[PDB]
C-alpha cells in the first residue's frame with residue numbers, strides 16, 4: 030500500500046525510469062516476466078533468512094576468497110615454514126584505543142582459530158590465565174569476527190586464512206595482514222532485517238510436427254518510410270529464416286515497389302518444411318532501396334532492419350497479423366540483413382513499420398514436448414544402408430585413428446574453421462563424442478538445424494551430455510548457440526561448477542550474453558538474478574552493469590524489468606545504491622556544465638566554478654557519505670575539496686578525494702582517490718583490464734611472478750565512469766625532470782639492500798606488460814601512458830583500442846634504452862647481459878602460457894560481440910589474437926614468431 034508506493038519511488042530512482050511505465054506495457058511476456066520472476070526473489074530471500082543473523086551477514090559481507098585453497102609453490106615459499114605473521118587489532122573501551130597483537134600462525138588456519146590465538150596473546154599479558162586454564166570460556170571465538178583493517182571486508186566463513194584474497198595478496202606482495210577483532214553482535218545489530226513484500230502485480234492446440242506444409246509469411250505494407258523521392262527509385266523487403274547467425278534456407282525478396290506507395294501484399298514462400306523449424310528459428314528482414322544505375326551492377330542499400338522469433342515465449346508458433354517497428358542500419362553492416370541484430374520491435378514507434386501476416390492452421394500451433402522429441406529421436410535409430418550417407422556410422426565403425434582425429438578436432442580454437450567433411454565426420458561419430466565432452470560446441474555446429482530428425486537426436490545427446498568446465502560452457506552462451514536446450518545445458522554447468530569468485534570475474538560477459546536470449550524469462554537470467562540476490566558483491570556489479578546500459582533502447586526493456594525485480598528483493602542495499610546513483614548524477618550534471626558552458630575558461634576560473642558548485646548544500650550532502658561504486662567495501666566519507674581538481678587530460682576528468690571514515694583507515698589508506706571521467710566509452714578499458722587480470726592469474730598459478738596492475742574501472746553509463754587512482758605512481762614523462770634518468774630515479778627511491786627487489790619488480794612487471802600488450806594489440810605506448818610505482822612496479826594506463834585498430838601485427842610497448850638500462854642494472858651493453866637473458870625467458874614463458882589458454886580469451890571476446898564496442902563488431906576482429914598467438918603454427922614456431930616481432934620492433938636483441 031503506502032510502503033509499496035514508497036518502495037516504487039526508490040526502485041524508480043535506482044533504475045532511472047518509474048515502475049508505472051512497466052505497468053502500462055501491454056505485452057503479456059513483459060507482465061508474465063514481472064510476475065513469474067518473483068519466485069527467484071522468494072527463493073533468494075528464504076536463503077538469506079535460513080540461518081539468521083549469520084546468513085544475512087554472509088549475503089551482505091560474502092567472503093572475498095580465491096577459487097582453490099591450494100597455494101602455488103612460489104607463494105608458499107614466501108611463508109616462514111608454511112606460517113604467516115598476522116597483526117590483530119583490538120579497539121579497547123575509552124578514547125577508542127588501538128592495541129596490536131602480532132601472531133605467527135599456519136597459513137591454513139580458520140578465522141575462529143585465528144581469533145582464539147589473538148585472545149590467548151591478549152590474556153597472556155595477565156599471566157593468571159596463561160598457566161591455569163587459558164581457555165577463558167571456549168575463548169568465545171563465537172563472540173568475535175575478523176574484519177580487514179581500513180575496509181568493510183569480513184572473514185565470516187570457515188575458510189583457510191590463505192584462501193581469503195586479502196591474505197594471499199599480503200603473502201604475494203610481502204605485506205603485513207592487519208585484521209581487526211570486532212564483536213559478532215556489533216556487526217549483526219548494524220545489519221537490518223529485510224522485509225521482502227510481494228508487489229501488487231503478483232496477484233494478476235495442435236503440434237508443429239503434425240503440419241504437412243512449407244513455410245509462408247505475408248508482407249502487407251510499410252509506414253514511416255520517409256526517403257528522398259529524388260534519390261530512391263524503388264524499394265523492397267528482403268527476408269530470411271535464421272537459427273542464430275546461420276540461414277536455414279535461401280533468402281526471399283518481395284517484388285520491387287515505388288517508395289511513394291510501399292504496399293506489397295505478397296505471400297513469401299520459403300525452402301523449409303514447418304515441422305523442420307528449430308525451436309530458436311527467427312524471421313530476419315529489412316527494407317532495402319534499389320537505385321543506380323549508370324550502366325553498372327544494381328545499387329542495393331538497406332534502409333532499416335528487424336528480426337522476429339518464429340515461436341513466442343509460450344512455445345506457440347507465431348500466427349496472425351503482426352507489425353514490426355524497424356531499427357536503423359548500424360555503420361558498416363555487410364549483408365542487406367542483420368541476423369546478429371536484436372530480435373524485437375523498436376520501442377520508438379515513429380520509425381519504419383512493416384506490417385506482416387503469418388499462416389493460420391485452424392488451431393493454436395505449439396512446439397512439441399520432450400516426450401514427443403525423445404520418442405522421435407529413438408524412432409530415428411544394414412552395413413550397405415548406413416554406407417549410403419556420410420552422416421551415418423553404425424556399430425563397429427570407430428577405428429583408433431578416427432578416435433584420435435576427433436580428439437585433435439576438439440583441441441582446435443573456437444575461430445578455427447571446421448570443414449563440411451569434418452561436420453559429417455563429427456555428426457556420424459556423435460555417440461563416441463560423449464567420451465570427449467569438451468567437443469560439444471564443435472558437434473553442435475555440425476548439426477543440420479533445418480532437420481527435425483537430426484535436432485531431435487541432438488536434443489537427446491545434450492540431455493545426457495556429461496558436464497564441461499564453466500569456461501568451456503560459456504562458449505555455448507554466445508550468439509552461435511541459440512538453442513534453449515544447448516543454453517540450458519550451459520547454465521546447468523555454471524550452476525554446478527562456477528564459483529562466486531569466477532562468477533564475479535566473468536560477470537561482464539554473462540550480463541552481455543543475456544542480450545542473445547530469445548525470451549525475457551530464461552535459465553540464464555534466473556541463475557544470474559539468484560546469484561545477485563544471494564551475494565551482494567555480485568549484486569552490486571550486476572546492478573551497475575545493467576544500469577550502465579539503460580540509455581540503450583535495444584536493451585532498456587529487458588534490463589529495466591530485470592533491475593526492477595533485483596531492487597524489489599535486494600533489501601537494504603537499494604538505499605545504498607540510491608546514494609551512489611544520486612552521487613553519480615551530481616557528478617554527471619557538474620561535468621556536463623564544465624564540458625559545455627565553461628569549457629573555454631581558464632583552469633583557475635574552472636576550478637573557482639567547480640569549488641563553488643561542490644560547496645552547494647544539496648551537492649555536498651549528495652556527494653559524501655556513500656559507498657565507492659568501484660568497490661562497495663570502500664566507504665567514501667567527507668570530500669577533501671582541497672585535493673579535488675579538474676585534470677589537464679582531454680574530456681577534463683575530475684580527480685576526486687574522499688576521507689576513509691574506517692577507524693583503522695591509517696593501516697590501508699586515509700584518503701580514497703577516484704577519477705570521474707565524462708566523455709569516453711569505458712567499456713573497452715574495462716574488458717582490457719579484465720583480460721590483464723586473467724593473464725596475471727594464469728601466470729601466478731603457473732609459478733611466474735609477473736606482477737600486473739589491473740586497476741579498477743567501472744562504466745556507470747553512456748560514456749561516464751570511475752577509474753581507480755593507483756597510489757604513489759608517475760608517468761615516464763613525469764620522471765624525466767638522458768637514458769639513465771629512469772634508472773637513476775628508481776635507484777634514489779630504492780637505496781641500499783631494497784634496490785635488488787625494485788629492479789626485479791621492474792623487470793618482472795615489464796615482461797608481463799610486454800607480452801600482454803603484444804597479444805591484445807593495445808594502442809601504441811609512449812611516455813605519458815606508461816607509469817611506474819615508487820617500489821619499481823611498471824604498468825600502463827589509457828588503453829583505448831585493442832586488437833587491430835589500424836585496419837601487420839604491431840608491438841605496442843617498444844622498450845627504449847631507458848627500460849633496458851634498469852633491467853641491466855645500469856649497464857652499457859644492456860642487450861648482452863645475464864639480466865636481459867633472464868627477462869627474455871620471462872617473456873617467452875609468459876607468451877606460451879597465454880597461448881595454452883587461447884580458447885578462453887577467444888570466448889571472452891566472443892561473448893562481448895553483443896556490446897556495441899566499435900573495435901569488436903565481428904569474429905574477424907577477434908581473429909587478430911589468432912595471429913598474435915600463432916595458433917595455426919606449432920609451439921616452437923610461435924616462439925620464433927614472437928622473437929621475430931620483438932627483434933623487428935627493437936631493431937635487434939631478440
Ligand SMILES: Cc1nc(N)nc2c1c(-c1ccc3oc(N)nc3c1)nn2C(C)C
Pocket residue numbers: 678704706714740742752753754755756757758759826827828829
Ligand atoms: C589510474 C591513474 N592512476 C594514477 N596514479 N595516475 C593517473 C591515472 C590516470 C588515468 C586516467 C584516466 C584513465 O582512463 C583509463 N582508461 N585509464 C586511465 C588512467 N591518469 N593518471 C595521471 C594522468 C594523473
